[PDB]
Design an enzyme around this catalytic site. Structure first.
Site, PDB file in Angstrom:
ATOM      1  N   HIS A  38      36.366   9.279  69.460  1.00 59.85           N
ATOM      2  CA  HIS A  38      35.484  10.200  68.738  1.00 59.85           C
ATOM      3  C   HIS A  38      34.282   9.399  68.254  1.00 59.85           C
ATOM      4  O   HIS A  38      34.147   8.212  68.551  1.00 59.85           O
ATOM      5  CB  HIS A  38      36.202  11.027  67.650  1.00 59.85           C
ATOM      6  CG  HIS A  38      36.684  10.258  66.455  1.00 59.85           C
ATOM      7  ND1 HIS A  38      37.871   9.559  66.451  1.00 59.85           N
ATOM      8  CD2 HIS A  38      36.196  10.167  65.189  1.00 59.85           C
ATOM      9  CE1 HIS A  38      38.067   9.028  65.253  1.00 59.85           C
ATOM     10  NE2 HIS A  38      37.060   9.376  64.464  1.00 59.85           N
ATOM     11  N   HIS A  78      33.023   8.485  65.273  1.00 65.88           N
ATOM     12  CA  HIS A  78      32.919   7.665  64.072  1.00 65.88           C
ATOM     13  C   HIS A  78      32.810   6.179  64.420  1.00 65.88           C
ATOM     14  O   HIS A  78      33.159   5.736  65.516  1.00 65.88           O
ATOM     15  CB  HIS A  78      34.121   7.895  63.161  1.00 65.88           C
ATOM     16  CG  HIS A  78      34.125   9.234  62.497  1.00 65.88           C
ATOM     17  ND1 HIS A  78      35.264   9.799  61.958  1.00 65.88           N
ATOM     18  CD2 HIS A  78      33.122  10.116  62.273  1.00 65.88           C
ATOM     19  CE1 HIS A  78      34.957  10.969  61.427  1.00 65.88           C
ATOM     20  NE2 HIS A  78      33.665  11.187  61.605  1.00 65.88           N
ATOM     21  N   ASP A 111      34.388   3.527  63.592  1.00 69.60           N
ATOM     22  CA  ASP A 111      35.582   2.768  63.945  1.00 69.60           C
ATOM     23  C   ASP A 111      35.950   2.932  65.407  1.00 69.60           C
ATOM     24  O   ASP A 111      36.814   2.197  65.892  1.00 69.60           O
ATOM     25  CB  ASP A 111      36.783   3.094  63.020  1.00 69.60           C
ATOM     26  CG  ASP A 111      37.146   4.583  62.959  1.00 69.60           C
ATOM     27  OD1 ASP A 111      36.229   5.442  62.942  1.00 69.60           O
ATOM     28  OD2 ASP A 111      38.358   4.922  62.780  1.00 69.60           O
ATOM     29  N   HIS A 135      40.949  15.827  63.297  1.00 67.25           N
ATOM     30  CA  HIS A 135      40.228  14.919  62.408  1.00 67.25           C
ATOM     31  C   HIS A 135      38.724  15.057  62.614  1.00 67.25           C
ATOM     32  O   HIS A 135      37.937  14.958  61.659  1.00 67.25           O
ATOM     33  CB  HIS A 135      40.700  13.492  62.709  1.00 67.25           C
ATOM     34  CG  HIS A 135      39.807  12.400  62.197  1.00 67.25           C
ATOM     35  ND1 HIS A 135      39.859  11.943  60.900  1.00 67.25           N
ATOM     36  CD2 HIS A 135      38.873  11.646  62.823  1.00 67.25           C
ATOM     37  CE1 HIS A 135      38.985  10.961  60.745  1.00 67.25           C
ATOM     38  NE2 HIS A 135      38.368  10.764  61.899  1.00 67.25           N
ATOM     39  N   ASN A 177      39.827  11.425  55.086  1.00 65.56           N
ATOM     40  CA  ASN A 177      38.493  11.967  55.299  1.00 65.56           C
ATOM     41  C   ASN A 177      38.600  13.258  56.104  1.00 65.56           C
ATOM     42  O   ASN A 177      38.995  13.242  57.275  1.00 65.56           O
ATOM     43  CB  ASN A 177      37.657  10.927  56.040  1.00 65.56           C
ATOM     44  CG  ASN A 177      36.287  11.454  56.447  1.00 65.56           C
ATOM     45  OD1 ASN A 177      35.752  12.367  55.812  1.00 65.56           O
ATOM     46  ND2 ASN A 177      35.720  10.888  57.511  1.00 65.56           N
TER      47      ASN A 177
HETATM   48  O1  LIG Z   1      40.322   9.421  58.347  1.00 73.27           O
HETATM   49  C1  LIG Z   1      40.282   8.637  57.376  1.00 73.27           C
HETATM   50  O2  LIG Z   1      40.586   9.024  56.203  1.00 73.27           O
HETATM   51  C2  LIG Z   1      39.911   7.185  57.592  1.00 73.27           C
HETATM   52  C3  LIG Z   1      40.822   6.214  57.215  1.00 73.27           C
HETATM   53  C4  LIG Z   1      40.526   4.845  57.404  1.00 73.27           C
HETATM   54  C5  LIG Z   1      39.305   4.476  57.923  1.00 73.27           C
HETATM   55  C6  LIG Z   1      38.395   5.442  58.284  1.00 73.27           C
HETATM   56  C7  LIG Z   1      38.683   6.820  58.125  1.00 73.27           C
HETATM   57  C8  LIG Z   1      37.484   7.508  58.602  1.00 73.27           C
HETATM   58  O3  LIG Z   1      37.386   8.725  58.634  1.00 73.27           O
HETATM   59  N1  LIG Z   1      36.458   6.720  59.026  1.00 73.27           N
HETATM   60  C9  LIG Z   1      35.204   7.142  59.597  1.00 73.27           C
HETATM   61  C10 LIG Z   1      33.920   6.687  58.886  1.00 73.27           C
HETATM   62  C11 LIG Z   1      33.327   7.490  57.935  1.00 73.27           C
HETATM   63  F1  LIG Z   1      33.934   8.647  57.597  1.00 73.27           F
HETATM   64  C12 LIG Z   1      32.147   7.118  57.310  1.00 73.27           C
HETATM   65  C13 LIG Z   1      31.528   5.928  57.641  1.00 73.27           C
HETATM   66  C14 LIG Z   1      32.096   5.114  58.591  1.00 73.27           C
HETATM   67  C15 LIG Z   1      33.276   5.512  59.206  1.00 73.27           C
HETATM   68 CL1  LIG Z   1      33.960   4.476  60.418  1.00 73.27          CL
HETATM   69  C16 LIG Z   1      36.912   5.333  58.913  1.00 73.27           C
HETATM   70 ZN   LIG Z   2      37.169   9.209  62.404  1.00 72.14          ZN
HETATM   71 ZN   LIG Z   3      39.546   6.750  62.050  1.00 69.63          ZN
END
Ligand SMILES: O=C(O)c1cccc2c1C(=O)N(Cc1c(F)cccc1Cl)C2
Ligand SMILES: [Zn+2]
Ligand SMILES: [Zn+2]
Length: 230
Positions: free
Chosen positions: A83, A85, A87, A148, A179
């Site tokens: 996806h 994001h 990461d 997600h 998130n």
């Molecule tokens: O799904 C989760 O809760 C979650 C847990 C651990 C790490 C992450 C997420 C998540 O939604 N990330 C996306 C994200 C973001 F939303 C904003 C800025 C940068 C980035 Cl990589 C990173």
């Molecule tokens: Zn994500």
């Molecule tokens: Zn993630």
């Protein structure tokens, strides 16, 4: 033992053997005032390697390539981001500079651009409707529907019965929704139902963040998402 967040300094990457010819990669990154872990996948593709997801940024993804060369020693020739994001796509420019052809769905590519993230080079065809699946070398790519994120893909390795759920699947110890800013909470349970229907023989299930498990992670994630909505 699977490596945990406190065991991996930001900028280092660990590889973990899941099955013959299948590894996860684990990295860490500063996020939301903390440091979080993140997983991707590596699958042997003949004499080459297929990478699923970056290691969450350029520096980490460079470390990923170095660790792959040290431990495996076959070239990474293609990567798929599951996806938009950071990461999942942060580091695709490093991959391209190293000779890797990077791929994502057209939706993921557009969403990444608007978000200000790096953009995989090539578009994957055949993944635009929920339940679509396509073969990509030694894996099957599956679009389960919005969860997600609206664009999230899952990856199955048939030879090893490994289901990489990515960020649509939560680890067991995550008991409240994370998130959801980009999520479709109403659709997420149905998207998980599609994953279960398609991959009922999965023996290993990898989440986007945290510890691997089995198909129990699917029902667990459904329960967490519904609890958030209820
Ligand atoms: O799904 C989760 O809760 C979650 C847990 C651990 C790490 C992450 C997420 C998540 O939604 N990330 C996306 C994200 C973001 F939303 C904003 C800025 C940068 C980035 Cl990589 C990173
Ligand atoms: Zn994500
Ligand atoms: Zn993630």
């Amino acid at each position: 033992e699977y490596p945990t967040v406190s065991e991996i300094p930001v900028g280092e990457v660990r590889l973990y053997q899941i099955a013959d010819g299948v590894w996860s990669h684990i990295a860490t990154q500063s996020f939301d005032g903390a440091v979080y872990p993140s997983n991707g996948l590596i699958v042997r593709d003949g004499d080459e390697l297929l990478l699923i997801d970056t290691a969450w940024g350029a520096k980490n993804t460079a470390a990923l390539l170095a660790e792959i060369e040290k431990q495996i020693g076959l070239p990474v020739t293609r990567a798929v981001s599951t996806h938009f994001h950071d990461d999942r796509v942060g580091g695709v420019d490093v991959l391209r500079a190293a000779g890797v052809a990077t791929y994502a769905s057209p939706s993921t590519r557009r969403l990444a651009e608007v978000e200000g993230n790096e953009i995989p080079t090539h578009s994957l065809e055949g993944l635009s409707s929920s339940g679509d699946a396509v073969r990509f070398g030694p894996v099957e790519l599956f679009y389960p529907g919005a969860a997600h994120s609206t664009d999230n893909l899952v990856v199955y390795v048939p030879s090893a019965s490994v289901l990489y759920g990515g960020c649509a699947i939560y680890e067991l110890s995550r008991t409240s929704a994370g998130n959801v800013a980009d999520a479709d909470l109403a659709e997420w349970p149905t998207s998980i139902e599609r994953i279960q229907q398609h991959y009922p023989e999965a023996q290993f299930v990898i989440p986007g963040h945290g510890l691997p498990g089995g198909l129990d992670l699917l029902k667990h994630t459904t329960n967490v998402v519904k609890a958030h909505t209820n």
